[PDB]
Every structure is written in structure tokens, then in C-alpha cells.
């Protein structure tokens, strides 16, 4: 199916994902469009942070779902 990813105030983008794929695949598919490396992208849904290991099925993701994208604030 298809999913939507939106920034705080920027445009919205569409990805072709399936429940089994890990968040790594979603981050990579985001990268091809914007170019942000996966290590820098922070993906959130329903106000809860996501993890690379888990997948859409783990986060009960479904069709026409909107996720929120942020750029990592590396601490050092």
C-alpha cells in the first residue's frame, strides 16, 4: 500500500510500503526523494518515536497513514 510522510511545515511525500518492511526501508525510500541519510531522519507517528528494527506491522501502520519527519539533532 501507500503511506504519507510530512514535515513540520513543508510539503508532503508518498511512499509505496508494505507492513512487513522495517523502518529502515521507509527511511531509505525517504532518502531517494529528499536525500536525507537514514541516520539523520527521525520518523514519528501518533506522537511516539519509531525504531529501525521494528516494521509497519509492529506499529500497526495501515493505509493512508501520515507520519511526521524531523532532522536529527546530534548531540556529541
Amino acid at each position: 500500500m501507500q503511506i504519507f510522510v510530512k514535515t513540520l511545515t513543508g510539503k508532503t511525500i508518498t511512499l509505496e510500503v508494505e507492513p512487513s518492511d522495517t523502518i529502515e526501508n521507509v527511511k531509505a525510500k525517504i532518502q531517494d526523494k529528499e536525500g536525507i541519510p537514514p541516520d539523520q531522519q527521525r520518523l514519528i507517528f501518533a506522537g511516539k518515536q519509531l525504531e529501525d528494527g521494528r516494521t509497519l506491522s509492529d506499529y500497526n501502520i495501515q493505509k493512508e497513514s501520515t507520519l511526521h519527519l524531523v532532522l536529527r539533532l546530534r548531540g556529541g
Binding site: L8, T9, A46, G47, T66, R74, G75
Partner: protein
């Protein structure tokens, strides 16, 4: 001076000489001499101060000084009266002009006397805090009120009369004298006269400072106690001098940052250094993989790109104010990234360095940020800038009517990244219903939460980061408008980019009317260009990217010019909702320029 310094050292620590009132008056008479130049006056001040350390010398010094001041003011009153009368009647008579222009004029001697007494009662650095009372008593004992009133009348006559040109500077020393009798009193008697006098004669004070900025280092520094009088040019010159007063050499601090990740690279390189190190360090930037750029040039590009990246909403640090995409305010949800406080502090220090480096930033902050950094409390007036229309609704609720139309409660509903949440303005705010009996506190709580509480920690980190480079007391001398001008500067609207990224209807890029319009625009001052841009789009700030980023109510909308067949006398019209400009086809360039000037000026 040498002999008296040795004598005072011996006394404080064989037979010693004893001075008598006649000798003290004799040495004081040095001040009255027409040959008392700056070096002579300074040496005489040192001699008098050294003598004062001997028992009984201070009382005689004070008595003689007050007697001399009374005697000289006796003549100064009549001289000022005659000068004011001549100015009102009016070339000014040379005879009375020489009474002020000459270095032996009574005004110079009065200034010297006042400076001498101030030096006597101020070089006692450990006693000034308690000797201020007796110093003010001595100044009042000189009954200088009539002289101050006459000086005020003379300055008023100078303001009214143009036949004297800018000759008011002949009274420059006397004005200085006034500052001397007020620099020690409390300004937070003569005290009641300082503020009204400066308020009345701010024009002359600013003119004098502009002509001779060095005066700020002298008694005129007291004018900081009344920042309203100082014009932005004099204020910024003084601020630059004070901030640069620590003229210590700046060690070079080369860095290397990638253009794409300039924000994060700069954060890593600089945020992990010493505050004083960055304060005193000259930054030499070196973009990774760059070419053909010198050390100095890269700094401006680095500042520009770093400012552009910091306020990128994707970082969840700052959000663009609605209708004011150029200006941003701190983001409430910045808590998603645990490091947001540190990044806000980094933004503060980089802004402080930019102010120190005199590198203007196209970024802008809502009125709340400026007011808070200046220490002023934030109210609905700041809310106007952030949400103009919504602020209008709030004020209409508060005053324009008795509301009671909406069932809103003392709580705010928000959607944090898909998570719906409710925040209570006050305890039990969710259930209490907003009514006319509790609307006055409701609006106050709403604005306080929106502007201050929702950003408390982030704005505190931003402020502590900023103050690390600029003293809070040193920056509070400005105001909201002046502070904004300090960071961003006067807006500069480009002409080539504006022309290329424009559209026409019933007109062509080569049309005679379009050519006339662009010729007129290219012949406008920067302020005039900003005024025209505001008249066209409603705001004086060009979009971050440029004129290709022009946006309206419906979104992106480039500047458009449309022919108007109405009477040529019709003033050009505009619709800011779509950056639309309906222009009549003026036959002549001069007529078009005049009409456009009239339109843009009447817009404000």
C-alpha cells in the same frame, strides 16, 4: 604636580609645610586663567586632588569652588539672556558671540569648575557612594537653576530660529556642565530637570553627537540613562564602541564545515569551545570542498547559510510566524529532540557573535523574542505580530463586545505529531467555561502561555547563550524596532531578481509602461523599495530564497502587474492577497514615478 604628589605621599604615610586659604585660592585661580589648556587643566586637577589629602584642604577647596561658580554663573545668566534675545531678533553680534566661542568664555570656566568639584568628590572611589549626598548639596549650593532655565530658553530659541544655522554648538560646553551636575544623582532637585531637558532638546543632542561622536565618551555618556533621546545612529555607534571597547586582539579560529550540514558541523565545531574563546575569536570559515574563496569572504556566506539552516522548520526548533514566513518564533515541540536546549543556546551565541561581527542576518524573530531579550514583559501587543488576525479576534473578545459566543474553556488543544493533547492554562482549566466574568484573565493566561510558558526553557537557554557574548545591561539600551534593525538591518529589496521573477497581464517585459515602472523602481532608495514591496505584498521582507518564493493567501504567488484602462489620473492600486499590482499606462516616466511614489507613501 610632582612636588605635591610627593608631599601628599609623605603626609599620608621632618617638618611639613602648611597651606593657607590664600594659597589655596591662588592655586585654584589657575583654572580661571585663559591659558588653562587641556594638559594644564589635567595637571591642575591632579595638583588639587593631591593637596586635598592634607587636613583642612578639602573644605577650603569646596568653599572656593562654590564661590567661583556663583560668581561666574552671575554673569552667565545675563550672557544667556542676551544671547537668547539676539537669536530671537535675528548675523549675530560678534561681541556677544566671542563671550561663548572664545576658550576664555565663562561657560568653559564653569565647566572646568564643575569638573574639578566632580573630580574631587569622585576620585574618592571608596567614598563616592556616600559622598554623593554632599556633592549634590554643594551643586545645589551653587543655585544654578536660573542658568539652566536660561540655557533651556536659548536652546528653544535656537530650535525656533533658522537664521543662526547650527550655531547652537557654541553652547556645547554649558550643556556638558549640566551633565556634570547630574551624572552622580539618581535618575531611576536637578534630577527632575535632567529628563525634561533631554526630552526637549534631543534634536540638538543627537545633532551634536553625530557631529562629534567622541562626546559620548565624555559627560554625554549620561544620556544612556534616557535611551529615548539617542537616535538609532548614535545609539548604534555608541553600542559598537562599547562592545568593541574590549579591543584585545582576536585570535584566529579556523574551522571547516560542510555546506549541506553547515548547521550541524558548526554546532559541533563551535558549541564545544569556551564562551570567552568564541567571544574573543575571529572566525575564519572554510567550506568543505570549496574553491576560490578567501578567509574573509567565506564568513559572510557561512553566516547566511547557517542562519538559513537554523530556522529550517524541519529541525523543529523554530516555526515561521503565520503571514510572516520570514520571521520565526521558537517551536514548542522542540522537546522531541533531547538536545534542543543546547541547540537553542548555540543559536543564542551565534546570534550574539553575528551582532558582534556586524554581519546582518535576514532572519527575523517575533516581537516576543525581542521584548524578552530586552527584558520587557510580553503582552498581547507581541501576540499581534505572531497572529495578526487572531490577535484581532482576541482583542475583540476582550473589549469590542461581551463575547459569550464560543464555549471555549481555559485550555488549549494541540496536535503534537498526530497526538492530540490538551494543556490547562490554569488548574481545572478544562472544565471552567470562558465567560465575560473571566475573559480578562482568560486572555492574559492564553497570551502568557503562548508567548512565555510554552517556550520557558527553550527561551531561557537562548537568552543565556546570547548573553554569553553581549552584556544584558549593554543591549537593553535599544528597543524592539532598534533591536530588530540591529540584527537584520534596513531591508534591501533587489531589483534584478524582482524583475526576472515577475508576471504580467496585458503587458510584456518589453512594454513601454513596464520599462517605465522598472526604471522608476531601480531609481528608488532602499527604504523606498521596501515601502513599495510592503504596499504590493503587505510585508517589507523579501522571501528567504528570493522573489521566486513570493507567497500569498493561497500559497506561492509571484509578483504580477496588470494593465488598468481607468483614468490615467487614477493612483496605482494593489491587492496584497495575491501580490497583484494594477497599474495605469502612464505616458511619461516622470508621471509614473510621481504616481507610484504617492501610492507607496499614502500606503503608510
Amino acid at each position: 604636580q610632582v612636588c605635591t604628589k610627593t608631599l601628599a605621599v609623605l603626609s599620608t604615610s621632618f617638618h611639613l609645610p602648611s597651606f593657607d586659604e590664600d594659597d589655596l585660592m591662588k592655586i585654584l585661580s589657575i583654572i580661571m586663567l585663559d591659558s588653562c589648556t587641556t594638559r594644564v587643566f589635567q595637571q591642575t586637577l591632579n595638583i588639587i586632588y593631591n593637596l586635598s589629602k592634607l587636613q583642612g584642604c578639602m573644605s577650603i577647596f569646596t568653599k572656593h569652588l562654590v564661590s567661583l561658580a556663583i560668581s561666574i554663573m552671575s554673569k552667565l545668566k545675563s550672557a544667556l539672556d542676551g544671547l537668547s534675545r539676539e537669536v530671537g531678533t535675528i548675523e549675530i553680534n560678534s561681541e556677544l558671540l566671542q563671550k561663548f566661542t572664545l576658550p576664555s568664555s565663562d561657560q568653559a570656566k564653569l565647566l572646568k569648575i564643575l569638573t574639578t568639584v566632580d573630580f574631587l568628590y569622585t576620585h574618592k572611589r571608596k567614598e563616592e557612594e556616600r559622598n554623593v549626598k554632599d556633592l549634590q548639596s554643594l551643586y545645589d549650593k551653587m543655585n544654578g537653576g536660573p542658568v539652566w532655565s536660561s540655557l533651556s530658553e536659548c536652546l528653544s530659541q535656537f530650535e525656533k530660529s533658522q537664521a543662526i544655522n547650527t550655531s547652537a554648538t557654541i553652547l556645547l560646553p554649558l550643556i556638558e556642565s549640566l551633565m556634570v551636575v547630574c551624572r552622580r544623582s539618581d535618575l531611576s532637585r536637578v534630577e527632575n530637570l535632567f529628563f525634561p531637558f533631554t526630552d526637549a532638546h534631543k534634536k540638538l543632542l543627537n545633532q551634536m553627537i553625530r557631529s562629534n561622536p567622541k562626546l559620548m565618551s565624555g559627560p554625554f555618556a549620561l544620556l544612556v540613562k534616557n535611551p529615548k533621546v539617542l537616535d538609532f545612529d548614535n545609539k548604534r555607534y555608541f553600542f559598537n564602541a562599547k562592545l568593541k571597547s574590549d579591543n584585545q586582539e582576536r585570535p584566529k579560529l579556523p574551522i571547516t564545515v560542510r555546506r549541506e550540514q553547515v548547521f550541524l558541523d558548526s554546532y559541533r565545531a563551535l558549541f564545544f569551545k569556551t564562551n570567552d574563546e568564541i567571544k574573543n575569536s575571529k572566525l575564519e570559515i572554510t567550506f568543505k570542498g570549496e574553491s576560490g574563496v578567501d578567509a574573509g569572504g567565506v564568513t559572510r556566506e557561512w553566516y547566511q547559510v547557517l542562519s538559513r539552516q537554523m530556522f529550517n522548520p524541519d529541525y523543529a526548533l523554530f516555526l515561521p510566524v503565520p503571514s510572516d514566513k520570514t520571521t520565526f518564533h521558537p517551536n514548542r515541540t522542540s522537546g522531541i529532540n533531547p538536545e534542543h536546549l543546547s541547540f537553542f543556546k548555540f543559536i543564542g551565541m551565534i546570534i550574539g557573535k553575528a551582532i558582534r561581527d556586524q554581519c546582518f542576518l535576514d532572519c527575523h524573530f517575533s516581537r516576543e523574542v525581542y521584548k524578552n531579550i530586552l527584558g520587557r514583559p510580553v503582552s498581547l501587543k507581541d501576540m499581534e505580530s505572531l497572529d495578526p488576525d487572531y490577535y484581532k479576534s482576541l482583542v475583540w473578545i476582550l473589549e469590542n463586545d461581551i463575547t459569550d459566543i464560543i464555549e471555549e474553556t481555559f485550555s488549549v488543544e494541540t496536535d503534537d505529531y498526530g497526538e492530540h493533547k490538551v494543556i490547562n492554562l490554569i488548574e481545572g482549566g478544562k472544565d471552567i467555561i470562558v465567560t465575560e466574568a473571566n475573559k480578562q484573565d482568560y486572555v492574559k493566561k492564553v497570551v502568557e502561555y503562548k508567548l512565555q510558558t510554552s517556550v520557558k526553557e527553550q527561551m531561557d537557554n537562548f537568552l543565556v547563550g546570547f548573553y554569553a557574548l553581549i552584556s544584558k545591561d549593554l543591549i537593553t539600551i535599544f528597543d524592539e524596532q532598534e533591536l530588530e534593525l540591529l540584527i537584520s538591518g534596513l531591508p534591501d529589496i533587489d531589483v534584478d531578481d524582482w524583475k526576472n521573477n515577475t508576471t504580467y497581464v496585458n503587458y510584456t517585459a518589453t512594454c513601454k509602461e513596464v520599462s517605465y515602472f522598472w526604471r522608476a523602481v531601480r531609481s528608488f532608495d532602499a527604504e523606498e523599495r521596501a515601502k513599495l514591496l510592503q504596499f504590493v505584498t503587505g510585508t517589507s521582507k523579501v522571501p528567504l530564497n528570493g522573489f521566486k518564493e513570493l507567497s500569498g493567501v493561497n500559497g506561492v504567488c509571484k509578483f504580477s502587474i496588470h494593465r488598468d484602462f481607468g483614468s490615467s489620473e487614477r493612483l496605482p492600486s494593489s491587492h496584497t492577497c495575491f501580490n497583484q499590482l494594477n497599474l495605469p499606462p502612464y505616458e511619461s516616466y516622470e508621471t509614473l514615478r510621481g504616481s507610484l511614489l504617492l501610492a507607496i507613501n499614502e500606503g503608510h
